[PDB]
C-alpha cells in the first residue's frame, strides 16, 4: 500500500496508519525529583544569569509565529545567553517547529556550544479531521525537537493527534524521553507555562501567573551529598 497516494486521495496522513518493565525507572525518577519550581519572567528583559545554579538539562520552547496560524523570532532566540546558564557537561532540547527553525535551531545549538546528537520528531496524526507556508513544497505534519550535548529504550519519534488550532502545547512525552536519559537533576524549562509546571523541573516563562523560585532554596536541593545524582537514583 502507498500511504502517500492514500493521503492524496483521502486526506488521511500516512502516520495515521502506524500501529503500536520501565516503571521502576519512572519511580526512581519520581522519588529523586526536586519540588517543582517556577518563575514568571520576561526572558527578553531578563538576565538569565540570575538563574542559578548551572543546569544539566535545558528545555527550550520559544513561542514561534508559525505556532499561531509576543511571538519570538529566531533572531530573538539566537541572542539568548544560553551558554551562561548551562553546565560544562549539559544537554538542551530545543523545539524548532518545522520551517526555518530546522536550520536556525542548529545555528543556535552551535552558537551556545552544543553539537546535535539526536533529532526527535513529533509526528501529528489527523484521524479526527482528514494552510501552507509559501516556501513550502509539502504539507507540514510534524515538528522537530533537537537534542544537543556539550562537554563529555526510547525512540526519536513522538506520535500524537494534531492538537486543536491555537493549542500550542507540545506533547508531554518529550518530558519522559528527557527524564529517561538520567542526565542530572537541574532541569530548566524556558518558556514553560502554568500548564507545563512539573516536578523535577524549574519553569521560567513570561505567562506564568505565580512564582516560587528562590535561587538559594533551589540550590539547596543539589548541595552535597546530592551534587551529582543522575535523577534515576535512590
Amino acid at each position: 500500500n502507498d500511504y502517500c497516494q492514500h493521503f492524496v486521495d483521502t486526506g488521511h496522513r500516512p502516520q495515521n496508519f502506524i500501529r503500536d518493565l520501565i516503571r521502576l525507572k519512572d519511580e526512581l525518577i519520581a522519588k529523586s525529583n526536586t519540588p517543582p519550581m517556577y518563575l514568571q519572567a520576561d526572558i527578553e528583559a531578563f538576565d538569565i544569569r540570575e538563574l542559578t545554579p548551572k543546569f544539566d538539562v535545558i528545555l527550550l520552547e520559544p513561542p514561534l509565529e508559525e505556532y499561531y496560524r509576543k511571538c519570538w523570532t529566531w533572531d530573538d532566540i539566537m541572542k539568548l545567553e544560553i551558554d551562561e546558564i548551562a553546565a560544562p557537561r549539559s544537554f538542551i532540547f530545543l523545539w524548532c517547529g518545522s520551517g526555518e527553525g530546522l536550520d536556525l535551531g542548529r545555528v543556535c545549538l552551535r552558537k551556545w556550544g552544543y553539537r546535535r546528537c539526536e533529532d526527535i520528531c513529533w509526528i501529528k496524526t489527523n484521524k479526527n479531521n482528514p494552510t501552507l507556508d509559501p516556501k513550502a513544497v509539502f504539507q507540514r505534519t510534524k515538528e522537530h525537537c533537537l537534542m544537543g550535548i556539550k562537554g563529555t529504550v526510547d525512540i526519536d519519534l513522538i506520535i500524537t493527534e494534531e492538537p486543536e488550532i491555537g493549542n500550542i502545547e507540545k506533547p508531554v512525552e518529550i518530558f519522559h524521553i528527557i527524564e529517561h536519559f538520567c542526565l542530572g537533576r537541574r532541569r530548566l524549562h524556558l518558556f514553560g507555562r502554568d500548564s507545563t509546571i512539573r516536578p523535577g523541573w524549574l519553569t521560567v516563562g513570561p505567562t506564568l501567573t505565580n512564582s516560587n523560585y528562590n535561587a538559594e532554596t533551589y540550590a539547596s536541593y543539589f548541595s552535597a551529598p546530592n551534587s551529582y545524582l543522575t535523577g534515576c537514583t535512590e
Partner: protein, 199 residues
C-alpha cells in the same frame, strides 16, 4: 525520452554537463559518518544540474548538518524536510546513540524559482516498509512525480532498483550505460567518443 535511463560511472569523475538541466535532483550519498569524504561531497558538480527546481537529499547522523552545508554551498535554500518512518510488514516502527532511530531524513532544497510545481499535494511524512540496506522507499517517486509531472529528473548514487521513467540514474553498480534522450546521446558521444569516463 520518458523510459528509464542510466549511466554506470563514478559520480566524482563524470562530466555531468553533458546531461542537461533537471526539474528535480535526488541523491543518497555515502556520507563518511565505499564512502565519499566531506570535500568530495562538497566538490560534486550539483550546481550545473539545475536552473530552477528541487533537490532531495537523504541525510543521517552528522550528515544532517553536513548535507545542509552542501545544500547551501550548491546554491539551494532548504525549504522542507521529509521524514520516512520505517515500519515492518505490519506497520509497526522497526526501531534499531542516545535514542533508537525510527526514521530517516531527506532534506528538500529549492534553487531558482520553479514554476508549475504542485506544491502541497503530499505531506512531509512517508510511512513505508524497510527493505534492503540503505534502500530508500519507492513512495518518494510518486510524491516527486505528483510534484513535477512529466519533467526530467536525476538520481545520484542509485542502484538498478532505483531506475524509474522520466529519470536518469547514476551509480557505480549500474549495469553499464543506457541512454535514449537524443540530446544526451549526442553530447555523450562528443564528450565520450570512446565510452570511458576517467579522471
Amino acid at each position: 525520452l520518458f523510459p528509464p535511463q542510466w549511466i554506470c560511472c563514478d559520480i566524482r569523475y563524470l562530466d555531468v554537463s553533458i546531461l542537461g538541466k533537471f526539474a528535480v535532483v535526488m541523491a543518497d550519498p555515502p556520507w563518511d559518518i565505499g564512502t565519499l569524504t566531506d570535500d568530495e561531497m562538497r566538490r560534486l558538480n550539483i550546481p550545473v544540474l539545475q536552473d530552477d527546481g528541487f533537490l532531495f537529499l537523504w541525510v543521517t547522523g552528522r550528515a544532517m548538518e553536513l548535507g545542509r552545508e552542501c545544500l547551501n554551498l550548491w546554491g539551494y535554500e532548504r525549504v522542507d524536510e521529509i521524514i520516512w518512518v520505517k515500519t515492518n510488514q505490519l506497520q509497526r516502527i522497526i526501531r534499531t546513540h542516545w535514542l533508537n532511530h525510527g526514521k530517516e531524513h531527506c532534506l528538500v532544497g529549492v534553487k531558482g524559482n520553479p514554476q508549475g510545481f504542485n506544491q502541497g499535494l503530499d505531506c512531509d511524512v512517508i510511512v513505508a516498509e524497510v527493505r534492503s540496506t540503505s534502500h530508500k522507499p519507492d513512495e518518494i517517486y510518486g510524491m516527486i512525480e505528483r510534484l513535477s509531472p512529466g519533467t526530467r529528473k536525476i538520481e545520484l548514487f542509485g542502484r538498478p532498483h532505483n531506475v524509474q521513467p522520466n529519470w536518469i540514474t547514476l551509480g557505480n553498480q549500474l549495469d553499464g550505460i543506457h541512454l535514449l534522450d537524443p540530446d544526451v546521446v549526442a553530447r555523450f558521444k562528443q564528450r565520450y567518443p570512446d565510452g570511458i569516463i576517467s579522471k
